[PDB]
Design an enzyme around this catalytic site. Structure first.
Site, PDB file in Angstrom:
ATOM      1  N   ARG A 156      51.057  35.243  42.417  1.00 50.83           N
ATOM      2  CA  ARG A 156      51.016  36.624  42.917  1.00 50.83           C
ATOM      3  C   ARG A 156      49.681  37.325  42.667  1.00 50.83           C
ATOM      4  NH1 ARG A 156      53.868  36.580  38.322  1.00 50.83           N
ATOM      5  NH2 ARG A 156      53.071  37.828  36.583  1.00 50.83           N
ATOM      6  N   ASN A 157      48.947  36.863  41.652  1.00 46.75           N
ATOM      7  CA  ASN A 157      47.589  37.323  41.357  1.00 46.75           C
ATOM      8  C   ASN A 157      46.459  36.450  41.926  1.00 46.75           C
ATOM      9  OD1 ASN A 157      48.068  39.786  40.002  1.00 46.75           O
ATOM     10  ND2 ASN A 157      48.671  38.682  38.157  1.00 46.75           N
ATOM     11  N   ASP A 170      43.481  39.977  39.877  1.00 50.17           N
ATOM     12  CA  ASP A 170      44.478  40.607  39.011  1.00 50.17           C
ATOM     13  C   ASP A 170      44.776  41.954  39.662  1.00 50.17           C
ATOM     14  OD1 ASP A 170      46.015  41.731  36.969  1.00 50.17           O
ATOM     15  OD2 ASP A 170      44.550  41.362  35.404  1.00 50.17           O
TER      16      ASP A 170
HETATM   17  C1  LIG Z   1      38.421  38.302  38.110  1.00 48.35           C
HETATM   18  C2  LIG Z   1      39.527  38.903  37.242  1.00 48.35           C
HETATM   19  C3  LIG Z   1      40.728  37.961  37.234  1.00 48.35           C
HETATM   20  C4  LIG Z   1      39.016  39.044  35.808  1.00 48.35           C
HETATM   21  C5  LIG Z   1      39.937  40.268  37.746  1.00 48.35           C
HETATM   22  C6  LIG Z   1      40.148  40.688  39.067  1.00 48.35           C
HETATM   23  C7  LIG Z   1      40.514  42.009  39.056  1.00 48.35           C
HETATM   24  N1  LIG Z   1      40.800  42.850  40.156  1.00 48.35           N
HETATM   25  C8  LIG Z   1      41.371  42.484  41.339  1.00 48.35           C
HETATM   26  O1  LIG Z   1      41.750  41.347  41.577  1.00 48.35           O
HETATM   27  C9  LIG Z   1      41.581  43.571  42.366  1.00 48.35           C
HETATM   28  S1  LIG Z   1      41.701  42.952  44.071  1.00 48.35           S
HETATM   29  C10 LIG Z   1      42.299  44.357  44.965  1.00 48.35           C
HETATM   30  N2  LIG Z   1      42.462  45.545  44.432  1.00 48.35           N
HETATM   31  N3  LIG Z   1      42.900  46.378  45.285  1.00 48.35           N
HETATM   32  N4  LIG Z   1      43.046  45.803  46.416  1.00 48.35           N
HETATM   33  N5  LIG Z   1      42.670  44.463  46.277  1.00 48.35           N
HETATM   34  C11 LIG Z   1      42.707  43.526  47.332  1.00 48.35           C
HETATM   35  C12 LIG Z   1      43.806  43.498  48.185  1.00 48.35           C
HETATM   36  C13 LIG Z   1      43.873  42.601  49.236  1.00 48.35           C
HETATM   37  C14 LIG Z   1      42.822  41.724  49.466  1.00 48.35           C
HETATM   38  O2  LIG Z   1      42.868  40.828  50.494  1.00 48.35           O
HETATM   39  C15 LIG Z   1      41.716  41.759  48.631  1.00 48.35           C
HETATM   40  C16 LIG Z   1      41.658  42.648  47.571  1.00 48.35           C
HETATM   41  N6  LIG Z   1      40.516  42.393  37.735  1.00 48.35           N
HETATM   42  C17 LIG Z   1      40.801  43.650  37.171  1.00 48.35           C
HETATM   43  C18 LIG Z   1      39.987  44.116  36.131  1.00 48.35           C
HETATM   44  C19 LIG Z   1      40.235  45.358  35.554  1.00 48.35           C
HETATM   45  C20 LIG Z   1      41.290  46.143  35.994  1.00 48.35           C
HETATM   46  C21 LIG Z   1      42.096  45.694  37.034  1.00 48.35           C
HETATM   47  C22 LIG Z   1      41.855  44.454  37.618  1.00 48.35           C
HETATM   48  N7  LIG Z   1      40.157  41.286  36.968  1.00 48.35           N
END
Ligand SMILES: CC(C)(C)c1cc(NC(=O)CSc2nnnn2-c2ccc(O)cc2)n(-c2ccccc2)n1
Length: 297
Positions: A156-157, A170
């Protein structure tokens, strides 16, 4: 804040909503002048829900982390838009959505109706599944390399894109579509218990070794076509099974060598688990191996 790239609001054109969380609304948008070869492209745009005081800092740390962590199998971050409100984060759009949805939509009992462009009709074959698993493993090698601990590794992530390119992300613990994948402790803390090793459940320690365990569980999700781990169990029953040393059974679609890789991730003592570098090597060897070899597993 300086390291984080910036996108002018005028270059971003929202098309429609893709999803929604407690921390933001995600939209599909057009982004202009982001790249040389592509004059216009599609992006996911997270608009910040500025309700709480701390959400602005979470936005900042997320944008800072994602500017530092960049790799072929990590979600691609293009920058932020801070001029005016709401604040926007801009990402590469992955057209197949999350890997869990994708796995379920090409499960068993899937006919010729599923497929096209980048995936064959019906259930994903062994090569495709090993390909999926190898990519995720590669992404975890990178994070392991930088001594980052994910803590919520699961399908899911993971996002899937054109040509089944898979990237780790994430997405909070925020989307209600996967609320049953977490155990709510008291108020607001959510724990992905079914993905967690015994030392994380008992002693609340999260390390690189607890991620490898979780990758093991991702490998089982993949080979069960997105089935929830311990779906037969309630949350507390799951905590009991995991803490008492019970292991998920070999899936029907999973051959013995791949189950051996899973068991490598599930050694009870963290020290005894195989490194994510070894797991990736094994999976990629399997993923890239000729038809003749793979047909004999
Ligand atoms: C790389 C790592 C695992 C460390 C990571 C990734 C993220 N963040 C993400 O994966 C947000 S991807 C995303 N966000 N909103 N929409 N979206 C989205 C929707 C559909 C799509 O096709 C494409 C994108 N973090 C993280 C770090 C701090 C706080 C929160 C997350 N850490």
């Amino acid at each position: 804040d300086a390291c984080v790239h910036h996108i002018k609001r005028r270059d971003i054109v929202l098309k429609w909503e893709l999803g929604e969380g407690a921390f933001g609304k995600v939209f599909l948008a057009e982004c202009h002048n982001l790249l040389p070869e592509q004059d216009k492209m599609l992006v996911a745009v997270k608009a910040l829900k500025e309700a709480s005081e701390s959400a602005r800092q979470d936005f900042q740390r997320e944008a800072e982390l994602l500017t530092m962590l960049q790799h072929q199998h990590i979600v691609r971050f293009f920058g932020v838009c801070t001029e005016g409100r709401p604040l926007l984060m801009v990402f590469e759009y992955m057209r197949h959505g999350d890997l869990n949805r994708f796995l379920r939509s090409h499960g068993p009992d899937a006919k010729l109706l599923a497929g096209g462009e980048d995936v064959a009709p019906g259930p994903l074959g062994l090569g495709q599944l090993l390909a999926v698993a190898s990519q995720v493993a590669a992404g975890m090698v990178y994070l392991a390399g930088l001594h980052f601990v994910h803590r919520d590794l699961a399908t899911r992530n993971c996002l899937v894109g054109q040509g089944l390119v898979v990237k780790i992300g994430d997405f909070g613990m925020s989307r209600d579509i996967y609320s049953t994948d977490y155990y709510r402790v008291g108020g607001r803390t959510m724990l992905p218990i079914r993905w967690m090793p015994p030392e994380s459940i008992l002693y609340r320690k999260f390390t690189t070794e607890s991620d490898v365990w979780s990758f093991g569980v991702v490998l089982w999700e993949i080979f069960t076509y997105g089935k929830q781990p311990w779906y037969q169990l309630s949350n507390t029953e799951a905590i009991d099974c995991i803490t008492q040393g019970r292991e998920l059974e070999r899936p029907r679609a999973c051959p013995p060598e791949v189950y051996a890789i899973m068991r490598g991730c599930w050694q009870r003592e963290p020290q005894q688990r195989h490194s994510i570098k070894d797991v990736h090597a094994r999976l990629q060897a399997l993923a890239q191996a000729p038809p003749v070899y793979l047909d004999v597993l």
